[PDB]
Design a protein around this ligand. Structure first.
Ligand SMILES: *Cc1c(COP(=O)(O)O)cnc(C)c1O
Ligand SMILES: *Cc1c(COP(=O)(O)O)cnc(C)c1O
Ligand SMILES: *Cc1c(COP(=O)(O)O)cnc(C)c1O
Ligand SMILES: *Cc1c(COP(=O)(O)O)cnc(C)c1O
Ligand SMILES: [Cl-]
Ligand SMILES: [Cl-]
Ligand SMILES: [Cl-]
Ligand SMILES: [Cl-]
Ligand SMILES: [Cl-]
Ligand SMILES: [Cl-]
Ligand SMILES: [Cl-]
Ligand SMILES: [Cl-]
Ligand SMILES: [Mg+2]
Ligand SMILES: [Mg+2]
Ligand SMILES: [Mg+2]
Ligand SMILES: [Mg+2]
Lengths: 398, 398, 393, 393
């Protein structure tokens, strides 16, 4: 809930979810693959039915021991009453929002939300009678003026996608609660991996992650999670279940397994990405660095107050708009950074966007820069090698 | 499309989807686990973007080589233009219907639809402005009188869940097309495993399966599929994608692998379940047998005309309503049949329902029986042992 | 057994291992955690008796497979290995010492021979060979230092079926303490009940029919009570184990082994009968085909056939003819291994067979074609074979 | 190397194996399909050189791991095994024949000793032992038939660090053709660059730090150019391989090996320093701790430490005291193995150590506690240890 992580977080990451009933003697939970779950007697079936959302084996779509172990781990780490599981982050966002809306409702979403989240609202929700309005990520307490009589969901994403703006969550939450005390406040907390920003301790109701990113941590598994408080858990659980949302047991196991190294990984991503950001900030070919941990970045003071650390994803703006030829010369010839979507793994990644491309995914807003934007994921490689790779890139476009 | 399977179906099941680009030298496709997919150059990224729904590697949520292989296999076997993948059958049903509706639309669903499919309509669609009407499975050509000006989707399930009624699909499709030529006709084709009833050859637009059942075939993996014709594919693909629907690469691999034994498995399930059904039909403690392949069962003549075989799931009605004590004595003491939900695996399963329980999931209808209903899945055990197990059960309740 | 299909579906599936699912859980582990010193003492005492102790001894997943294999093949224990070749090499090694002698059928799988001639020989263990139809005359080849008699029925590639009752009885008359072993992969351990015939250890490349899908490798060795502890402890000293996931997939393969084998039998016998009438075929080696070597023993001693067999062409094909033949099949694929759902094809020149037939000569001079008959439509497979014949006629 | 972290992230990741993903594909196979006779001939010629041929030689997934291991440990080839004990047993077996002699450190992992005394001995291969600090004096133990010198640094349990340069130089003076091998598991193959010191083969239980999560078992042996072909072919004749999925998980473990090891080093040295000041501790065996046996060689020859070490209590605990101590830890768990994210604890009575110290005597009489220091908060681990001390004070 503040700038210092729990003195026990690393111990919690190692131990979360690892109860004997799930591990059965191994260090990690067993992998129980199942659709059918067998009842020995009618009485056992009746008991399982009553407890089918409470961790008694009932049916594979409700979960096996492997899912229960992960759910317990996520609830412990994010401080929630329940954790719903999904095939990926985009499914978690879409189905968590859908669980709390109906015809006539209004959603208020940050204009820096991940593009698939925006597209779910404009292309799916709208045709189902749910409207979406937008807010600047630094709106703070002034979000109160945007809350409508039918506003049901306020959707935060801090830091923002691509441009990395950090919300003032305490100011936003206080303003929402003044006007609409029972609104459902949700956050896409993927960048913090759910642990660098303790969303539920700030009065957010549901913390959603693309567990694909830092929880899996190796670029090889896709999964979404949504951890809800006690007020919102049953509605989330049952409405996600009605949409058939689940993850396979093996990916659940790999997510639990990813948690165990999340501390050592995040500490490296923080150290390395802050070093790269500080270097870029001094570079003559860089106009702006968007890194939550870097002084001067948008919302940095809220990151410093409200987060316990940084991950490895950030962006910067070049001192000019690259031509198509320069973009190819720059991006095609990196040695260590690879061009790909996603982030959160062990490898460093790079992508580029022109300002007007970002403006097109900033609803009701324009961008305040004119140079080409570069988004970096800083992996686990030696930082001096990453710096040399970036320096060679600068020399190709100077 | 008729009573004789393709003389090449077993060869197709062995070979479907197994192209060198996916197998890379092994018999089976490779398992490619990925969120990030790497582009060597800007030009490669642009090409992948253009082809991101056409089998070029782009992003893990669109698929890896493993998904592409399964999609090709399903399109070949079910005769479709594309195959969308989902975390389970219930997600396939919910998201395929959702892909084709918006506020003000009407869905017309068989009253024997799988209960989660009904619950999606009444508990999710209704609050989003989409209404649902119901029809008796033997309505045939008279469904024309139920089509409303706003009817957009007609949802079939043949045989029906639990009670096993077989639709007259040719009569239903012809009537729908007379009134509403551009309606979206969908079927839950899980019982036929997509191959015993060639839905798209009958003018159905989308064939949905709980691939969990016979395609996986071993009770240990959950996955949904939806194979669409060319008219409906792009809308299904893009709207499922906006809801984040996908399956993990490993389950995709296991589904492809399940296809390879689907022929030998189904032939055994057919032989054994028909033998058990014929025996039950002669039994003094049995009032009715609901097996599509058994003469006298509801819609049997449509099964014989339109299907190329049977799977192993069916039900029967006892000569009396069991008391709770009798239900326990019966179900708790089977040696080979196990009590569990799901079906389609190698093991035989048993469940029971009282008539009023079934009536509660027959919208706008009553049931026409008063005895306890028993649903059997006939697995791969020796049929004479299964018969002995059923006979011992009868002796416990006589 | 009128109950084999029921046994295949249920073998190894006990609540201790399944924990509510149909299949065993997959327990991945090196470390296995003891709650207390008392618990560790109990696990130590029972570390080879199915109590969790250490990943190399097994997890719940391995125990479930071991129980399944012991039930199906009628043994006291089942050792697990990374592949069939490891099972053969380490099972033999477990029972020999310097100065011992091994008697092995000359139709044994080539890697099994190479283990004997290239590993055992440098460790002071000699190997002699016998014709697969030797029957009771094997007693004349038994030496005072012969410790192991190694059978393989049907034989590799050429498919000769031993007279196991005659061999066993002769061995027991002369060297009752000998360890009799069989590579029982072709029968999947279930079409020939090796331990019921007085064989001590039944070894399989579970890679083949038990896995059943060409996508996993694993060896098994099921031993009677007399030989189990020596097999288990010596294999363990060599570090032999299989991973938990492959153990799970082997248990899972058992569940369809009946339906698969019945189709392999039906389809392969049809193909063999057709080949046996074909003008371009010189000989068919199928145990289930009347006239094949040892067929009378197959009919008496086996409960069915699998899908692997071979035939001899009318000529020793040149490289050019072999390419025209093999390169252009549509359904049969060129690969090693067998036992899966796909049909496969492999050629062996008769001279290369002679080279893996120690102290024997082959009685054929044409190219030998080994077929694995998979789950494709049999008429399509026959058409593929016919098109191949037309490319070489 | 100032580039080790970059190498760990990138090793083995070539487009041929990754096919567009970040990690290698998982190719599960026994059968590998040849399109043509020409293709099969090329695969046969190159069946040990990274062309797809047969599942036992490897698939793309194995090849990627093999390239990663060869890059990281600087070798010509890497053989893969079902576990570390199989790697040790089969790597030694690959280079000995009847009449040969093995010289092994008396601090070797107990299964490695048992392989020598219970397997090799019955095959005509003898084994002698040496103290881990023998240094150049090992030349006096080398016999005309000594074929293998087997090192393990730090030693198992007691953590003594060899003077590898002195041992190697002495061996090369007297028996230049000898095969020098090391079990390099504690260093994860990367904190001690064995092949750069003139050792021929670096063996690991990749189960430990390479997998890194206590959930998979695998052995590796990386050989120089002189020894690779003999290791590769003899291991293959014993059927030694690992499954493709475990190979994938080992490659995947490499990616976090740097961040993991740095934390294991930092945390374990802090714990060791605290124990070294503690009134209830008699001795601390941590290579990175000044005063530990061979520490000067660790400081000179290693680039860091992992998280496994041990200490000796002031007394030989009774069963009752040992239960009060071990049963009630909250974070350290009782288990065998190590190298994962969890902290583990294991006790050894000094007499049981003497029994696995051939031709030596232990110089301590208290109970030895071996700790694996995992990724938990170090202050929590210290508190857990302190509570344990209070239960036995
Ligand atoms: C990547 C991303 C997602 C989407 O998750 P997927 O697993 O790729 O579907 C959701 N939220 C944020 C912030 C993301 O960066
Ligand atoms: C089982 C069932 C489903 C649901 O599939 P899941 O994989 O269990 O989510 C859908 N349709 C039918 C006909 C079913 O029987
Ligand atoms: C295939 C084969 C083996 C070896 O099996 P692998 O797992 O491939 O090493 C052993 N015995 C027989 C009869 C075989 O055909
Ligand atoms: C653990 C151990 C081994 C054996 O590894 P396994 O994979 O468990 O068989 C080998 N060497 C050392 C040093 C070990 O600690
Ligand atoms: Cl409100
Ligand atoms: Cl992205
Ligand atoms: Cl219309
Ligand atoms: Cl069900
Ligand atoms: Cl072969
Ligand atoms: Cl060939
Ligand atoms: Cl250990
Ligand atoms: Cl202990
Ligand atoms: Mg805009
Ligand atoms: Mg009703
Ligand atoms: Mg010969
Ligand atoms: Mg001693």
């Amino acid at each position: 809930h503040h700038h210092m992580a729990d003195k026990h977080l690393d111990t919690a990451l190692v131990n979360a979810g690892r109860r004997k009933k799930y591990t059965q003697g191994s260090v990690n939970s067993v992998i129980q693959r199942a659709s059918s779950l067998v009842f020995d007697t009618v009485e056992a079936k009746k008991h399982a039915t009553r407890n089918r959302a409470k961790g008694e084996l009932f049916y594979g779509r409700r979960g096996t021991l492997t899912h229960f172990s992960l759910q317990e781990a996520m609830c412990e780490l994010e401080g929630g009453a329940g954790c719903a599981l999904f095939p990926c982050g985009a499914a978690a966002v879409a189905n968590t929002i859908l669980a709390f809306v109906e015809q006539g409702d209004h959603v208020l979403m940050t204009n820096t939300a991940y593009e698939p989240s925006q597209d779910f609202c404009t292309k799916i929700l709208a045709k189902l009678g749910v409207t979406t309005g937008w807010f600047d990520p630094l709106i703070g307490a002034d979000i109160a003026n945007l809350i409508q009589p039918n506003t049901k969901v306020v959707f935060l994403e801090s830091p923002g996608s691509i441009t990395m703006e950090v919300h003032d969550v305490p100011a936003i939450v206080a303003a929402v609660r003044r006007v609409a005390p029972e609104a459902i406040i949700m956050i896409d907390n993927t960048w913090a991996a759910g642990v660098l920003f303790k969303a539920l301790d700030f009065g957010i109701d549901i913390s959603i992650q693309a567990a694909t990113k830092y929880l899996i941590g190796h670029s090889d598994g896709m999964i979404g999670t949504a951890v809800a408080n006690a007020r919102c858990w049953e509605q989330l659980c049952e409405n996600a279940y009605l949409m058939g949302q689940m993850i396979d047991a093996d990916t659940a196991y790999m997510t639990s397994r990813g948690l165990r190294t999340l501390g050592v990984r995040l500490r490296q991503h923080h150290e390395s990405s802050l070093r790269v950001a500080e270097w870029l900030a001094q570079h003559p070919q860089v106009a702006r660095v968007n890194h939550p941990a870097l002084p001067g970045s948008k919302g940095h003071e809220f990151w410093k107050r409200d987060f316990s650390g940084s991950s490895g994803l950030f962006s910067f703006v070049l001192n000019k708009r690259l031509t198509d030829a320069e973009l190819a010369a720059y991006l095609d010839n990196f040695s260590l950074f690879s061009m790909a979507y996603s982030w959160g793994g062990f490898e460093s990644l790079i992508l580029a966007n022109q300002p007007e491309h970002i403006a097109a995914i900033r609803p009701e807003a324009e961008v305040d820069f004119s140079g080409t934007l570069i988004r970096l994921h800083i992996g686990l490689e030696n930082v001096d090698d990453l710096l040399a790779d970036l320096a060679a890139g600068f020399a190709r476009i100077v």
